[PDB]
Amino acid sequence: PTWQELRQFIESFIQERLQGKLDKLQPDEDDKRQTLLATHRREAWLADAARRVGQLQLVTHTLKPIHPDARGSNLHSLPQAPGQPGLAGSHELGDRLVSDVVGNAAALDVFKFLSLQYQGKNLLNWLTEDSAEALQALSDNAEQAREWRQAFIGITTVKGAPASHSLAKQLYFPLPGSGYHLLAPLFPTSLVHHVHALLREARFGDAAKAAREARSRQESWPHGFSEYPNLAIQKFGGTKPQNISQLNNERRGENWLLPSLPPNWQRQNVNAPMRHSSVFEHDFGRTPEVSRLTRTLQRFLAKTVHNNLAIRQRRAQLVAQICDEALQYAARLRELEPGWSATPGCQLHDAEQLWLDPLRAQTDETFLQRRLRGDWPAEVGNRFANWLNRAVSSDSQILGSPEAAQWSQELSKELTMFKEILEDERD
């Protein structure tokens, strides 16, 4: 609270940077220590620091991640919270703002000067509020203190007219009545730095690596952990990551983009049954995705009723996803290649007729087209249901309880769905 302790702390920091400069000077002649103790030791340091202030800027939304020859505006603003629930960004951080710095990197001494926590809070937080401890410690006269503080508080404001460069992005948005808004967006560096710290904690943290080793030992640890697959890396500073920002020195580039991918992003090529052994292998013809799906179906055996409600709805969603993947597999297998009508034989499980929908009609117009339109081949659901009955564990206890009746009920419901969608194939 006392201004004398703050003044001693300021002199100690300026002297600390002086002895750091004298140590990193490696000097033996030319008398540079006199210019060092004249320019970097006196209270003219704060005068030249107030000179260096106008190059700096505290920002949460920098422009420089967009194409680096872009001289536009840069903001320090936290938006209001949206009234609509759910979605969020930039209005969640209350205390955890990192407050990124843009400007001349050689003038970073002013930021490390103001960034200390000397009494209980930030020094810029002291100079922003009118206090008796403030406006006097870096002073012998009041007017130069007013000038130094009027410099030091202006780093958080945008300097100049608002502008975005030609290489900055700006996007028309249709208003509901008519007309548009221009919507120039920025790169949220506080957001990327906060998500970067959380991802680095979840991937390289010791509290997660302990549980990661405890899974390999298969022991019982108090908390779980997470993995975050399919991250991508984007780097902004090409070879010089210092020129973009200050928080681009903590993370050297390394945007760490989360994946937002469709489920069919791995190309699964198509395999049609040709011979007899191909007719037994490719009758179900099953991807690793359904293996992963029915493996989690196998883990739904034990149940207490107050949890077994939610386990039953999750079972309904799981068998729903099973018949959806079966239908999509039939769709891409039937509309991808002519391989269902590639070579005949004796065994193809040719009662199927769903994996060969245009394969029996587009070439044979009278032979099999009447054999498909009049038959309406939909008996495949029963063999598919018998394929599903291997997914339940054939235990006498789960057979004897009512879980068998509940399970057969939900299979009959989703099987009816699969049947009625398989039915209308001729239209």
Binding site: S166, L167, I233
Partner: protein
């Protein structure tokens, strides 16, 4: 005063796709719709060190100690099959049209002055020098970059596609048409008038380009090589990665685009090269030297300001180059 716009931007006309490559035998290239693709596979290469010494380590000890430690690589190659001597490269081309209007402009005065200037150019002389040279670069297979340099016979087929079918078929011999002369042919003029009608109108014009190159059995073809940085760790790292769209080698789209814009023969230096690509400050990255420097008054920017602001219409070759930049597209603008 008609100051320049602070934001200028043109959409890329003459838009090509990724040029897939396939393989097969010559003299059944008419039924080349089911030819299998050329696949990119790995092979492992090694060799000694060939480049120049840094003049302070010229001693025989570390020289012989260096040639007893060869470098080890894993490179990608794309070879033709051992029973096929033809490389079939096929891509689709859209000529969009509306080649003068900017996609973004601050000043409306700059906008209608520039639109008036472009209209003045096109009713003075339409796109018939530019479309002639674009039809040349589609005619001689300059988009086959290194796949051209030793071929026995290259034949290029361009079919203009209507709403669903082939509206007009061309067929060229790309070795009879040289890589440095823009002459006059009948089919070349018909193709150039089709590209002219595309560039002037509002609808798009779609072209399918096929290029057969008779190299030889099992020889090497050269697709685009992917620019990757942050490569990883030397036990598993690959040294040279080829482009592959769907398990099939391919030339990048912008490489085909950079081949089609090789029409610029009006740069002030001598044409020991012949034509180069169209760029503002026209630079050849194989040559490493930027022709049309701003110290001479022959770059794109100053020519456009003299053509629109102060109305000094330059020579007809230089406004051919300016309109070629406008068909090329770009993002121009000061602060």
């Amino acid at each position: 005063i008609l100051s320049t716009a602070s934001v200028l931007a043109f959409e890329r006309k003459l838009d090509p796709s990724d040029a897939l490559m396939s393989a097969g035998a010559w003299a059944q290239r008419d039924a080349s719709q089911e030819w299998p693709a050329v696949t990119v596979r790995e092979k492992s290469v090694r060799g000694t060190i060939s480049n120049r010494l840094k003049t302070k380590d010229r001693d025989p000890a570390k020289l012989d100690a260096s040639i007893q430690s060869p470098n080890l690589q894993t490179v990608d190659v794309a070879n033709l099959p051992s029973d096929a001597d033809t490389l079939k490269v096929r891509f689709t081309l859209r000529v969009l049209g509306g080649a003068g209007t900017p996609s973004a402009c601050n000043d409306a005065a700059y906008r209608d002055k520039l639109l008036q200037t472009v209209a003045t150019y096109v009713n003075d002389q339409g796109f018939a020098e530019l479309a002639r040279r674009y039809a040349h670069n589609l005619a001689n297979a300059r988009f086959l970059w290194r796949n051209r340099v030793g071929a026995e016979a290259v034949e290029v087929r361009i079919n203009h596609i209507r709403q669903g079918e082939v509206a007009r078929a061309w067929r060229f011999d790309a070795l009879a048409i040289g890589l440095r002369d823009f002459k006059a042919d009948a089919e070349l003029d018909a193709l150039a008038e089709l590209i002219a009608s595309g560039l002037s109108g509002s609808g798009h014009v779609l072209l399918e380009v096929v290029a057969f190159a008779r190299i030889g059995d099992g020889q090497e073809v050269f697709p685009s090589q992917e620019l990757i940085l942050d490569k990883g760790d030397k036990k598993g790292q690959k040294s040279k990665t080829l482009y592959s769209v769907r398990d099939a080698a391919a030339i990048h789209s912008q490489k085909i685009g950079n081949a089609l814009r090789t029409i610029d023969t009006w740069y002030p230096d001598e044409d020991g090269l012949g034509p180069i690509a169209v760029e503002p400050y026209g630079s050849v990255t194989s040559q490493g030297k930027a022709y049309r420097q701003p110290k001479q008054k022959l770059d794109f920017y100053t020519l456009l300001d003299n053509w629109v602001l102060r109305d000094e219409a330059p020579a007809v070759e230089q406004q051919h180059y300016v309109i070629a930049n406008l068909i090329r597209g770009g993002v121009f603008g000061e602060a």
